[PDB]
Amino acid sequence: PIVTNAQGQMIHQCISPRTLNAWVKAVEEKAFNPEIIPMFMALSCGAVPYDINTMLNAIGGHQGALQVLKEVINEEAAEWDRTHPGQIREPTGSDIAGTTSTQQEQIIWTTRGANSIPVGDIYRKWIVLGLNKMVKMYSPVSILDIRQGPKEPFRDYVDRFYKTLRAETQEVKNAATETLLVQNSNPDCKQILKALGPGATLEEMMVACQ
Amino acid sequence: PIVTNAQGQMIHQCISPRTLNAWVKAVEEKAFNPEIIPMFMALSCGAVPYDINTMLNAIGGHQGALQVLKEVINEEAAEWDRTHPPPGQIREPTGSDIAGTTSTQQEQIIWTTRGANSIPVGDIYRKWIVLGLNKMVKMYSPVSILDIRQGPKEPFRDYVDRFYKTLRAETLLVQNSNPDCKQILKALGPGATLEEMMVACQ
Amino acid sequence: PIVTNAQGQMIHQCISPRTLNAWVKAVEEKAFNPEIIPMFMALSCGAVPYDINTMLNAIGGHQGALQVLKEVINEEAAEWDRTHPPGQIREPTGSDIAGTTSTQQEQIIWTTRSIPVGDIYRKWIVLGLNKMVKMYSPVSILDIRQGPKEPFRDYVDRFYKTLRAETLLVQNSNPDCKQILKALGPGATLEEMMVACQ
Amino acid sequence: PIVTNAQGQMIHQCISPRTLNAWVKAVEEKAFNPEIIPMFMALSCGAVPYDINTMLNAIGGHQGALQVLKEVINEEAAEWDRTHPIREPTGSDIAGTTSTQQEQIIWTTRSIPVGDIYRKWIVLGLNKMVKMYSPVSILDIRQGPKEPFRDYVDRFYKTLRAEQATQEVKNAATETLLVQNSNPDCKQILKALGPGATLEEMMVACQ
Amino acid sequence: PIVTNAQGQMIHQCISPRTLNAWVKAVEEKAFNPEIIPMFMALSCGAVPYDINTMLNAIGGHQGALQVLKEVINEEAAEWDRTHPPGQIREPTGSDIAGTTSTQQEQIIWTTRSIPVGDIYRKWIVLGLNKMVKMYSPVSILDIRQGPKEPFRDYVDRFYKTLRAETLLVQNSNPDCKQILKALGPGATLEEMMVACQ
Amino acid sequence: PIVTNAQGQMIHQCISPRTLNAWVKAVEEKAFNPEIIPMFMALSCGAVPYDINTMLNAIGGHQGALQVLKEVINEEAAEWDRTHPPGQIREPTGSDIAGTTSTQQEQIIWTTRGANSIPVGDIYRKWIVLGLNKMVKMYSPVSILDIRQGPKEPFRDYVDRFYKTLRAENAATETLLVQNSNPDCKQILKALGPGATLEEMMVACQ
């Protein structure tokens, strides 16, 4: 990340061994479940591209997934260059990816006074795009084929419903609640849920199926 | 959270990996047992809404539960906007600004640390989530206080813990005690403390 | 706890997640053995009643034990109210010291004005915890007798562990040691006893 | 690393016990898998050559590996002295063998980044070790008859990372083998997607 | 320990959960082997008697050992009162230094006026711990004899391990080394002895 | 170590529970393998002799090794006194640098004085590393001559045992490495000609 010294200058601070190991453990445990996105965003908070590359390269397995991320980064870096053909140069696509830029150069870009480019946040946005492709990828089933098992508790069916929905806005969710959640529930709950009338909250539904 | 830099300015500090894992492990282990409420309040203490959403979004399972929280948060945000109707300075925070959905890290700090009309969006948003979390504690409570009956050979100590654990999730203690203790408990006369009861059944 | 900001004002500081887990693990690991009393006192050091309630409420199990504590707290709060009947803070009631009817800020004003509401509430809880330590004590000190081939070292530790939860040491010692201990007369130090039985 | 004391002077900072043990555990756990390179670069971040030698010398096993590193360091030290005839730092000064902590700070804070240069040399030796402990060749990575393409892709790029470790400009032509060594059911699907399809498009079409 | 607030005054700082567990784990793991002495001095470094009693009281087992320590503390406290008989603070008694009749604040003023009551009380406890280290020493130095096929290096470690709890080294060595050791003449260092017995 | 208080004065700061346990665990796990030397220098960095003695005395086993160290410390302290015969501190003797006859405060004044600053902390660390090296060679069981590749041992593992033993005692002679390899590799290794790097050798025996 970036920090200010006693002198008031913007200097680089190395990513901590704790944060790096926390990221390694997260990818090993949480695979590419939807919660890997906020885990990445939290651990990469305030990081410059130099720090972020350390995180990605430190992952041991999942090398096919990391290859998908690196492909996505090249696409976004190319799109950047397309719209962006003793002072500091303007950052290229590879400069934002930290592959052709140094720690110090990345700090100058984020903290300069005129035309401040947050290269850290942009590169984080590129990686979230690749992670979203992987999160969508390890969830095969679509929200339409999420039907409550004959002897599945309604609590657990609701979690599979919204987990799958998460892998895919706030409003497109509300279209699935009143048309797919009630439709795909098992016959024991569909009778009870339709008996609560329209406009019932999700809380009122989960209690009525307990 | 918020911290002061070397110059004395109020700047954002990212939530620590320690705190984040402590909250993630807590939800994994404690489901929505009653003790999840004080854990959130302790771990999110001093957090801005940006930090708090990271905690909620880091949860892996319980996505149906989190949707109940999002309903409660929107309801409370509506109450805010209703009682807080809408160049150069920051805007006045809306309901969604306190929920951190339409406001940034910097804006949240400006609201909390400004000398004029300091609105603590972090504490307000924590209050909204505790309301949603309280709804979940009742929901994952399996047993009713009535089906907690002492086993024929169950120690009274362990029976008392299952009794008050169930009571926590949402004259009766003596009725549901096993036949051996019921004779002993009624023999202690009225007004006996829980200490006296646990000793007389050991 | 309480801290001073850059302006020099008394403000509330959140109990640390480390300290909270230390208390949670202590209750999980040390049950209600006698050493839970110093553990509570150390981990709740400098805490206002708001902080202490976070500690008690964070415990998952042991709810029967916590119910005994709240009975003790109500009794002590009543004793407070009995002896303590515009623009300034009210005088704290029993429940204000228990943090149930008082806020974080009110608790700081009381302590830093000069009524230490934090330490008083700790005294009430230690009183309740003492009742639980005696309660989970399985064996009575009278039924602590030295095994036939038990070393005097281990018997003494097992003896005083029981004594901690709530002339007899020499009586319940094995036959080999009682002769040696009675031959030293009464008033010999425990060092002299432990050396003479090794 | 280098830090400023209360007076504002550049003084040596002792490497922390946390960082040192993290590196010790990393070598114990990660052997010479490819991810040992980022571990070293992250844990040696901001380090002077004095600090870096403490990390290398703290390793318990793998003494044959360190001898490969020490050969590589001497090879790079010779190249340095050849192109570069306090004093001005020699090749051995960057390795921290003939220079002191204070001298290394003077060089870095003028400006020759002796810490970063010596890290660059050690990454060269560690890359040689990553390639060496790589068991399987990329040619013998073929998709199983009932192996899911997802799992085949991960074994493929695990192996591919291990042998392109010692390469400066990585050879992107080798990935074509992924389609060649894939099982007959997916090769039909992959040849049906034509060349230039992204790895995402391949992994979706084989699930 | 003692710290200075923003105003520059000496105020009490509570012992950290990290330090307290380090002390609890140490006594659990290292029993009363000789290395418990330096462990205590490091973990109780800078502590006032209030802090030190927290450490001792947090120990769960070893209650017979702690009972010997508390005996020694009273003896030293009596010796203090023996040699140390309005508006300002009283002069500290033996029990005041032991933290049994003195508060956190009183202890700090004494040290920060002087009298290092923390260091004195640590010194008294080291006396009791030394009595315990000698007491849990099982074997005497004479029954530490080099095995017939024991390497001299390993014999030396058992020799000085036992010797630490409370010219002989050469006597108790096996016949194979005694020939070599006596043949090196007197005044040879222990280093020289270990090379000649390898 | 030494730190500055709010007043700006040089005062002693107690060694951290983290560092001390790290040192205790290090000696328990790493015995007297060569890697014990870096652990000591890193964990004792910035320490005064008072702190360092706390580290040594906290070690539970290896009391014969510590007895060798105390001889070496006394030997080096004598060398100091031989070459180093009203209001401020005395000048430090050999035993003062070993922390046996000097206090915490005395050690700090010596290290932090502007004029004639004697770094008693670093000097005593040098004496102990000298003794610890003697123990590293001593727990080295085998001599470099009896390190021969097993009949079915992979050359990789033989190289590690070779240089581990060599580290315990700058000769820089690899003539034994090729000589003591098993007959299958010696044929291949001698066939690579002189001047081949260790990388090329380890690759050619895989």
Residue numbers in the entry:
A (entry chain B): 1 to 85, 94 to 176, 179 to 220
B (entry chain C): 1 to 86, 93 to 176, 189 to 220
C (entry chain D), E (entry chain E): 1 to 85, 93 to 120, 124 to 176, 189 to 220
D (entry chain A): 1 to 85, 96 to 120, 124 to 220
F (entry chain F): 1 to 85, 93 to 176, 184 to 220
From the paper:
HIV capsid has a pivotal role in regulating viral DNA synthesis and shielding viral DNA from cytosolic sensors. Previously reported X-ray structures of HIV-1(M) CA hexamers showed two distinct conformations with respect to a channel at the 6-fold symmetry axis. The beta hairpin structure (BHP) above the channel can assume ‘open’ (His12 forms a salt bridge with Asp51) or ‘closed positions’ (with a bridging water molecule between His12 and Asp51). Inside the channel, 6 positively charged arginines (R18) are hypothesized to mediate electrostatic nucleotide recruitment to fuel encapsidated DNA synthesis.
